[PDB]
């Protein structure tokens, strides 16, 4: 087919929002993914959006991906299901980049950013949800920008589109500072997105990313730090897991292996989230899962009361294949927290009484 039905359906929504831009800049993957190319997004459209500057919606460039959803419906890349359910991964990515004075065209770098995010989705098959975060650890545009990480949210304008191949929603990338990423992790992504909406330079109502932003929302409004602190104290973290570098070693719907001792291994970044796991999750009666990006190992920490776990108070370390579940009691979680003040490799922590070891190791270990 010369015009792909999934593609045409999204274009209808684009036309609705941009009736005066029938011919926007669009980039494309020179060797398409379904022909062996490295980049999963077939196209990225790049629109001018005049916004509503008086309402703290600056003029900006609006990017929309094509490829995460099912464009073609002929099983060249995604599995066809029908009008019901998700089309491909069920969403496309968007991004809103503040226009800098002098710019006559959208910068093309956000297409490369989007390809990176999509490559991860296609390879890991971990999907993105509104409120999720993506740590990145470099200026998104390769400048010296403090904007070095991302939160994900519903696009504030693009409505879900019904296509012959399923429903497609639109998930907007929002650039954030390290401090803001951390706040979303320790509290909740939705809460931080809402704060960004209230600070024009940090996003405003449409969560436009300003790559020239030099200050965090907490530096702009110190009172916001108190709001977040109170939130972490009262609500804990809503983070149920991360895709990360991790492993474990041997030191109900299934029979599981009962482990006498366990050795948990993390890289620097995942290791730094251990206190969140313990204090922000387990002490709130919740669970937290580290899921390997490289392979199939996963470590799910559970607290007493968590339902549907195969780790129990009597047998607290239990595995089904590469999936480890570890039940920690409140008393022991509190002890671990004290011992992990520092949260330089390797770092080793050992609790012989509980037959538990934690190592923080270089990334290569997890290859």
């Amino acid at each position: 087919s010369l015009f792909p039905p999934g593609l045409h359906a999204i274009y209808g929504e684009c036309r609705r929002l941009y009736p005066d831009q029938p011919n926007p800049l669009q980039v494309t993957a020179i060797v398409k993914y379904w022909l062996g190319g490295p980049d999963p997004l077939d196209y990225v459209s790049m629109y001018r959006n005049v916004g509503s500057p008086s309402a703290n919606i600056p003029e900006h460039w609006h990017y929309i991906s094509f490829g995460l959803s099912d464009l073609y419906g002929d099983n060249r890349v995604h599995e066809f299901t029908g009008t019901d359910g998700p089309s491909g991964f069920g969403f496309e990515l968007t991004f809103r980049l503040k226009r800098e004075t002098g710019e006559s065209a959208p910068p093309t770098w956000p297409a490369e950013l989007m390809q990176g995010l999509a490559r991860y989705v296609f390879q890991s098959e971990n999907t993105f949800c509104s409120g999720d975060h993506v740590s990145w650890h470099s200026p998104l545009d390769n400048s010296e920008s403090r904007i070095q990480h991302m939160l994900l949210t519903e696009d504030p304008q693009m409505q879900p589109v019904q296509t012959p191949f399923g429903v497609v929603t639109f998930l907007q990338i929002v650039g954030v500072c390290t401090e803001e990423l951390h706040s979303a992790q320790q509290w909740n992504g939705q809460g931080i997105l809402e704060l960004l909406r209230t600070v024009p330079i940090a996003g405003g109502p449409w969560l436009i990313t300003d790559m020239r932003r030099g200050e965090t929302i907490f530096e702009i409004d110190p009172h916001l730090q108190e709001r977040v602190d109170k939130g972490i104290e009262t609500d804990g973290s809503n983070l149920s897991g991360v895709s990360a570098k991790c492993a474990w070693d041997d030191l109900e719907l299934i029979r599981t292996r009962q482990l006498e001792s366990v050795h948990l291994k993390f890289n620097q970044e995942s290791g730094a989230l251990i206190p969140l796991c313990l204090r922000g999750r387990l002490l709130h009666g919740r669970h937290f899962t580290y899921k390997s990006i490289t392979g199939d190992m996963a470590i799910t920490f559970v607290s007493t009361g968590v339902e549907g776990a195969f780790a129990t108070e009597e047998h607290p370390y239990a595995a089904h294949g590469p999936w480890l579940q570890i039940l920690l009691t409140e008393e022991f979680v509190e002890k671990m927290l004290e011992d992990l003040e520092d949260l330089k490799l390797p770092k080793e922590y050992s609790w012989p009484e509980k037959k538990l070891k934690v190592s923080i190791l270089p990334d290569v270990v997890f290859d």
Binding site: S135, L239, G241, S243, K245, E269, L273, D363
Partner: peptide, 10 residues
């Protein structure tokens, strides 16, 4: 619950 996708560029 929300999810973190960590250092997915590497």
């Amino acid at each position: 619950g929300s999810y973190g996708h960590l250092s997915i560029g590497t």
